[PDB]
Design a protein around this ligand. Structure first.
Ligand SMILES: COc1ccccc1Nc1cc2cnn(-c3cc(C(=O)NC4COC4)sc3C)c2cc1F
Ligand SMILES: CCCCCCCCO[C@@H]1O[C@H](CO)[C@@H](O)[C@H](O)[C@H]1O
Ligand SMILES: CCCCCCCCO[C@@H]1O[C@H](CO)[C@@H](O)[C@H](O)[C@H]1O
Length: 341
């Protein structure tokens, strides 16, 4: 067992192994707080996330378990991965703190579009990396469901990694697929493609595509561009109210994407039209998108790997906080780090 040391950072008390020095706060989310640290064993800076109140309720416990099991499975350059997992606890009784260690990125994508003026080559590389990691995640039968700029970390090298939760230290609805905002509850993997399409449009133009003020304003904005849904889509909406509002709006023709995104790479416009499709059955998948001519300079089919199947069966079980905690402890003690290069 390594030597731990205790220091306080932003009303928060941190107990981390000796090998991580110079703890420096980066930001905070709702489920944890992130610090920068120097890894003496590798000579590289890293990010340490202390989970906030990990076992304070049934929801928190399952969430803690969920993040550990998921991040332990993700082994892909464009998806955040685990370099280390530790807890000062010496036993399961004495277990109540969880720390996760990953690579250290430079910022999130909304801290970059805030500068704006992103070149077209920059959009090809950034979106290609998202899709490439999206393909890996989707091959594991995982849906992100919350893709947004704050969940995309980037380096000054322009390398990108999909986070599970970003820093709140950019409304989520602006990037939500319309079916989620309708509460379909049977979401397709392509709900993430819609979000990617919303993010791409923002990178190319410098403005939020659908800056809706609420969930109802959000759908009116989506309809103004993609157009009122056809009869084939309407018959699939069971909600009379939802169907009533959609049809109640004065019909709006689909806008010419070429004009809305005039000045953009015509190959990018073509991709946006394939992602921003109302029917989720007709949206281009992540794997299909990587083969679009827009990513010709980066597409390498022998270097776009898939993931081993992920067991998500625990998601349905209703367990006690103590059982969620012991399972989390089991995952902590069993973690095997990836080998240093
Ligand atoms: C270990 O944390 C986590 C562990 C597991 C899952 C999620 C997380 N979360 C999480 C992970 C990273 C990894 N890099 N960044 C980061 C650093 C930024 C920054 O300002 N760096 C300075 C420039 O040199 C210091 S911006 C930004 C998005 C992160 C933010 C996170 F919320
Ligand atoms: C690295 C891959 C991240 C997987 C996405 C999990 C993190 C964001 O997704 C989480 O769980 C659900 C996922 O369907 C979302 O609906 C929730 O909003 C969020 O808490
Ligand atoms: C106000 C804009 C109307 C939104 C129409 C959303 C159509 C989404 O598409 C639908 O996704 C469903 C799952 O979510 C699938 O079950 C359907 O097969 C698919 O057509």
């Amino acid at each position: 067992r390594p030597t731990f040391y205790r220091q306080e950072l932003n009303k928060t008390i941190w107990e981390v192994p000796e090998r991580y020095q110079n703890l420096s706060p980066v930001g905070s989310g709702a489920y944890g707080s992130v610090c920068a640290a120097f890894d003496t064993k590798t000579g590289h800076r890293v990010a340490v996330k202390k989970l906030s109140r990990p076992f304070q309720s049934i929801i928190h416990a399952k969430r803690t378990y969920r993040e550990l099991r998921l991040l332990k499975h993700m082994k892909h350059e464009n998806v955040i991965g685990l370099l280390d997992v530790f807890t000062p606890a010496r036993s399961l009784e004495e277990f109540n703190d969880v720390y996760l260690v990953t690579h250290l990125m430079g910022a999130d994508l909304n801290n970059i579009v805030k500068c704006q003026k992103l070149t077209d080559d920059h959009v090809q590389f950034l979106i290609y990396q998202i899709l490439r990691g999206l393909k890996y995640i989707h091959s594991a039968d995982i849906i992100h469901r919350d893709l947004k700029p704050s969940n995309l970390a980037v380096n000054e090298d322009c390398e990108l990694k999909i986070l599970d939760f970003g820093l709140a230290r950019v409304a989520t609805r602006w990037y939500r697929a319309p079916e989620i905002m309708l509460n379909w509850m049977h979401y397709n993997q392509t709900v993430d493609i819609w979000s990617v399409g919303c993010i791409m449009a923002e990178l190319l133009t410098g403005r939020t595509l659908f800056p809706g003020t609420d969930h109802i304003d959000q759908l009116k904005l989506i309809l103004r561009l993609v157009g009122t849904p056809g009869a084939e889509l309407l018959k699939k909406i069971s909600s009379e109210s939802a169907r009533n509002y959609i049809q109640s709006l004065a019909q709006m023709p689909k806008m010419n994407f070429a004009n809305v995104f005039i000045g953009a790479n015509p190959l990018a416009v073509d991709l946006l039209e394939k992602m921003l499709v109302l029917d989720s059955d007709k949206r281009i998948t992540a794997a299909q998108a990587l083969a679009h001519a827009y990513f010709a300079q980066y597409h390498d089919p022998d270097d776009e790997p898939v993931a081993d199947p992920y067991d998500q069966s625990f998601e349905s079980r209703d367990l006690l906080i103590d059982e969620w905690k012991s399972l989390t402890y089991d995952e902590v003690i069993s973690f095997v780090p990836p080998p240093l290069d």
